[PDB]
Design a protein around this ligand. Structure first.
Ligand SMILES: C[C@H]1[C@H](O)CN1c1nc(N2C[C@@H]3[C@@H](CC(=O)O)[C@@H]3C2)cc(C(F)(F)F)c1C#N
Ligand SMILES: C[C@H]1[C@H](O)CN1c1nc(N2C[C@@H]3[C@@H](CC(=O)O)[C@@H]3C2)cc(C(F)(F)F)c1C#N
Lengths: 301, 296
């Protein structure tokens, strides 16, 4: 159906079916064990951020690769249950829709993960070339196939060149995985999110160190953002002024899975509403904190 | 008297194929993923269909997208699903299956959704005349005993040529199930159950447990790659060596392949010796393939 021009927030990235099993003891190889509880959850960074944007009251869309089948069916029904627009999915003829299997041991909190395979082709620059960008006010790209995503980012830049400042599509990039190919993505977007994990891998021992160490890698005018879990989040822009927000931890932590994606979606949302970077940092920390005391995404607002 | 009925579980298996079994607290990327219809009675129906046998499945399912996959899979195989016990409370069972590509080893993390099992009242509503053979996978034993008493009652009124043959499977090491040994013409006892009762071989298990079976019954015990043994009223122990593939790639459902193949061979009039050999043959062939396609 009709989507008003410059009304949606697009998130480009991964969707995965997460099968979480909670066990009394880790299974011995070649055995059958009854788990205590099992959950099927739609995951992925871009995927999780869409859930949060819908719950925040933002019209949003997901762009990512899926293969026709029963896994895709579950994921599409889950996206739709969360009011996520799924018209821009890159339907693939080869490969499996990603599925991960998580075994959580009760006696110690240990997590064993059998990650999805590599068979599914990622969204390409040619796939993205075919997208009418006019319905999007904001485009968020989760760093994966960087050389392709760079061409996608060059296409949004080309678009904005022909646009009055109010019809300009805002852009954000996420560098969450400590893979060198992704570090070229720092030079793209108005907002650049860098994970604690990536920063630590580059030798940075704090969000301040990471922002001061990596700011020279961003495009002119860009805002570099780094959330450091329960130590709050920092942002740094062209004025050279480091901004900080403390974390808003819940009275009891229940579920941290997707807290970072809650932060990213909330920062994007607050900025898209015309709020300052300081206000967006505080808001992202508040929503992220609220999420940590909740199972899943229900009740974050 | 044309169909083989299998009473038991249907489970959606979420299968991950790995290069090496994951060490606890680690992250490993799998090689490939698939969805497979599983459960012991359910797997035996797949094998019976592929063997050319008209078969039916009786088991509990709850309406939903999991049941939809399973029903479409059953139907794709030509398994008769008319006798499924549709439940209004619960979800359909699912499991996480890790298959090690190096050796075919399978590890299952199972989610028993606490769906109500098939009851004796559910089974009383079944027209037994279309069945030549009824196989029950041991689950809710006190309720399955009444189901077995119903088949016995039916056979009493039948001439020997129109008598329904009965098999029972005691796969789980739960004491409740050990009453099922006294029922059926063919009794399959797992290696796992035998080991739990202190038996170190199929011959030990058969000699140790034979006194527990019905008069004239055949006790069968498959001991994985060590082959299978059977023991009947003549007191003569029968053995078949396994048929291992040169490369074992997937053991998930090998035992169910054995059970279905023994049942099939016996239903065709073959000797117990021939049925044991055929059972090991087909199970062995399955172990060198992914899934059940190509076992025949
Ligand atoms: C996004 C960051 C901002 O820096 C604040 N916020 C928080 N992140 C936390 N984690 C991130 C990481 C999550 C795993 C995952 O993202 O899947 C672990 C724990 C924990 C808390 C907490 F618990 F203190 F509330 C907060 C708060 N506020
Ligand atoms: C049924 C028994 C007869 O005794 C022969 N047969 C085999 N069972 C095997 N397993 C049983 C158990 C399976 C897991 C599961 O049933 O889900 C493990 C391994 C392995 C092989 C093998 F590999 F050697 F071929 C054969 C053969 N033939």
């Amino acid at each position: 159906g009709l989507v008003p021009r410059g009304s949606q927030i697009l998130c480009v990235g991964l969707v995965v079916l997460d099968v979480i099993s909670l066990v009394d003891k880790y299974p011995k190889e070649d055995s059958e064990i009854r788990c205590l509880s099992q959950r099927w959850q739609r995951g992925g960074n871009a995927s999780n951020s869409c859930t949060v944007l819908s719950l925040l009251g933002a019209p949003c869309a997901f762009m990512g690769s899926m293969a026709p089948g029963h896994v895709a069916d579950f994921l599409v029904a889950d996206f739709r249950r969360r009011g996520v627009d799924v018209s821009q999915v890159a339907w693939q003829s080869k490969g499996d829709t990603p599925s991960s299997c998580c075994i959580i041991n009760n006696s110690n909190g240990n997590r064993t993960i059998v990650l999805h395979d590599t068979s599914l082709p990622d969204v390409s620059a040619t796939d993205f070339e075919k997208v009418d960008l006019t319905q999007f006010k904001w485009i968020h790209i989760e760093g994966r196939n960087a050389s392709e995503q760079v061409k996608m980012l060059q296409r949004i830049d080309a678009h904005n060149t022909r646009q009055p400042p109010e019809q300009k599509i805002r852009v954000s990039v996420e560098v969450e995985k400590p893979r060198e190919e992704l570090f070229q993505l720092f030079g793209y977007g108005d907002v650049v999110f860098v994970s604690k994990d990536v920063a630590k891998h580059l030798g940075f021992q704090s969000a301040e160190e990471a922002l001061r160490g990596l700011y020279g890698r961003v495009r002119k005018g860009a805002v570099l953002v780094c959330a450091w879990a329960e130590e709050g989040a920092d942002a740094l822009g062209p004025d050279g002024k480091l901004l900080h927000s403390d974390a808003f931890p819940p009275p009891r932590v229940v579920d941290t899975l997707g807290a970072g994606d809650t932060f990213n979606a909330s920062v994007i949302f607050s900025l898209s509403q015309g709020r300052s970077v300081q206000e967006a940092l505080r808001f992202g920390c508040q929503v992220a904190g609220k999420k940590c005391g909740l199972q899943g995404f229900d009740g974050i607002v």
